[PDB]
Paper text:
CpHpsN forms a domain-swapped tight dimer with 28% of surface area buried at the dimer interface, with the interface featuring extensive hydrophobic and hydrogen-bond interactions. Coordination of Zn2+ involves three residues from one monomer and one residue (His411*; * denotes the other monomer in the dimer) from the other monomer, showing that the enzyme forms an obligate dimer.
Initially, the protein crystallized as the CpHpsN·Zn2+ complex in space group P212121 and the 3D structure was solved and refined to 1.94 Å resolution. CpHpsN structures in both space groups contain a dimer in the asymmetric unit. Comparison of the CpHpsN·Zn2+ and CpHpsN·Zn2+·NADH·R-SL structures reveals rearrangement in the octahedral coordination environment at the zinc center. In the CpHpsN·Zn2+ structure, Zn2+ is coordinated by four amino acid residues: three histidine residues (His126, His251 and His411*) and Gln248, and the remaining two equatorial sites (#3 and #6) were modelled as water. The root-mean square deviation of the CpHpsN·Zn2+ and CpHpsN·Zn2+·NADH·R-SL structures is 2.0 Å over 407 common Cα positions. In the Ramachandran plot of the CpHpsN·Zn2+ structure, Asp352 is placed in the right-handed α helix region, while in the CpHpsN·Zn2+·NADH·R-SL structure this residue lies in the β-sheet region, demonstrating a significant difference in the loop conformation near the active site.
Residue numbers in the entry:
A (entry chain A): 0 to 12, 15 to 362, 367 to 436
B (entry chain B): 1 to 14, 19 to 120, 125 to 151, 157 to 215, 225 to 356, 372 to 436
Write the structure that this text describes.
Amino acid sequence: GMISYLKKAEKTPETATAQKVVTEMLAEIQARGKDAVRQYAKQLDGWSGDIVLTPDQIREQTKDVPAGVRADIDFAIRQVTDFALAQRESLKEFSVELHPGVTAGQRVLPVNVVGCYAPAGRYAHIASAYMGVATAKAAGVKTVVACSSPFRGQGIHPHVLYAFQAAGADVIMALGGVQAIASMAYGLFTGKPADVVVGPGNKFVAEAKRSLYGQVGIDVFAGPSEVAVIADETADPAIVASDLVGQAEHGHESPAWLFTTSRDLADRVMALVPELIAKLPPTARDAATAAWRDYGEVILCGTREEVVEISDRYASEHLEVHTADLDWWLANLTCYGSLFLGEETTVAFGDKTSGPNHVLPARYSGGLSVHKFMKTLTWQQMTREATRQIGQVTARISRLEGMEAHARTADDRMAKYFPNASFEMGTPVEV
Amino acid sequence: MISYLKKAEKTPQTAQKVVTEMLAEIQARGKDAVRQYAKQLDGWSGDIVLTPDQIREQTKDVPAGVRADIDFAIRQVTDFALAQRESLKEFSVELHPGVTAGQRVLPVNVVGCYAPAHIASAYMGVATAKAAGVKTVVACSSPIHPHVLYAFQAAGADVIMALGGVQAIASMAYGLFTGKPADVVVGPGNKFVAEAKRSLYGPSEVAVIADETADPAIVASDLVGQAEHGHESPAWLFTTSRDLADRVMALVPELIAKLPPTARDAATAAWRDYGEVILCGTREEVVEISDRYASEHLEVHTADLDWWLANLTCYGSLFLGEETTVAFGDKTSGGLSVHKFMKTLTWQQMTREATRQIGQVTARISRLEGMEAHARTADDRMAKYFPNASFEMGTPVEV
Ligand SMILES: [Zn+2]
Ligand SMILES: [Zn+2]
């Protein structure tokens, strides 16, 4: 019954002045198209060079990326690709017979164009650059357009650019912020408007994606990196603490949660975390100090079932499980971004997918995966014979609804397909 | 090679802020506050949650012939939804040796359905959610048209509530009366209901593709069919045949004129203001157009139906061939399907051996990104699993 907070969030988790800026910028971009984008690039980034990169510029600007660094990025990207490919196979097409003579089915096809944004900020994961691109390509999307702002006057940060290329981007553009999102959405420079745009950004990028796409633009986890660990008495406190500190270095708002049934484990982690932080270099130390302090939580529960309940409520983007009987946890947890089962894997090793935007005040729906880039289209087809029954039912129900024209769609078919037969087609609507 | 033989004459012209007040009251006061708004908006001072007896009583007047019709209609949605559910598969896969990953597929716990009209608008949400395996479906309808109430029950609603508007949506969302907050609420609603759902989790088209083999009488009747809904119902004809386009453009007014008053009025306005007839040179141009307009309901009256099924890429629901038609009913809405009510959860697990490579790749990438704490999670596993190892884990971050 009694859940026990050994450590509480000492601060609670947003002005929408982004709304004005985006409205204004989109208005301008709708008006002047490429020239407004190019001018925004100049005013905001000081950029005067080419927007669309050529295959030669790509090779040139990545030439100084060493083989060891390239092989590591290649490896990381392949982990994503291999999972996305398997996931693509998990949504099947089918046909099914319903009422005899009725056939219906689902087609599954990738969207035509996906735009991928990489903010390439100072403290960014390279995975932010390749995850969208790799996933879209593995979904079968035919055109992936990738944007990242110029790094230091030369062009796109070379690692981000290498990642874009290695992940299979079809077009790469040196563009940042709202004007990148808008250029992708409207198909500026390529003539290929994006069916969806993905990629983490500041509140302006978020707001442009919302404005242009609605819910499908804001249904991916955004905001400070999270980590949660479920642990029982078998868990190693030194590993649990390390993992929490791992994402706490992201910045002062990064939440780090431990859910446990072991008082002993909770106690040791709570003591270990500050010690681990103190041994980080300055930027990380200061970042994690604040993050652990204001957003770090430790929750001791009596039973496994209560852990599940609170974990499902918190719905961490990244959820590690360090327990005996891992099968039970996979079977019983229901809300999270992605699950890391067992001690061996860990959050830093990387996501296969990105979870939904669970911190939205729809919380379970969306995320970055192949499913985001797939359409399911439904169809039906009937023999004449099938309509004998369905025509009747439609006419009658229709006339009960007062939908006289609907009914005649059925009358006309009944007349045409069964000329020498009469049917109870309902009493016509006079009103 | 594309010409509009009939264009749309206008676009929809242009409030729902009270929500905040109703909601703020409901939040602070709960059931009481909702009960308040029941008498005040619907003249209801009975119980909200109906009991099985009430449901049987209030639907006892509904004849067995009508019930059979509705049950059948529901089955044609249910049976499709059951197949569609099985199209999203759980799986496990081995990536890099010793890396296992997978996908669970889980129905949500609770769905709320609002029915404010086609009876289909009442049963589509409920039947879809039940076919998806949702264990609790709450259905609301402002006080209840016996057909709507019969539809809820026959479709498999678990709780039915005589409740309307924002009260209904907020009730289901907060889970007042039942104690079961909906993971999502669905239904057709007014702008108040629209803003209510838009706060809490935030006209019927018809298009016909026709070639020279199409019967223009049937094509006209079908366009007329959905025009009769309101004055804002769009009815689009995409065609490669001027002959059909003219004969349709000719017969539509004559069909409208023969409809009873309300429908005549509705369909006149709609056909005038929103009707479009677009002639194209090639099948490829029709596809280009159809996909741009992405009609919610798209009929195809052509030779070579397989080609259109293969090439059309944007629509809500395809009606393939002449025999079926929009009035027969959707299987899904473009949207509402079983997929809307199911979660995908992804997981990974690794052997120690897998981390030998994955951990050192991670440590090196992490340190290049300036992410020292990240790198240390890899270091710590390497030390635990491979104690005497000396792999390249990258230079520690000093900054
Ligand atoms: Zn991280
Ligand atoms: Zn209709």
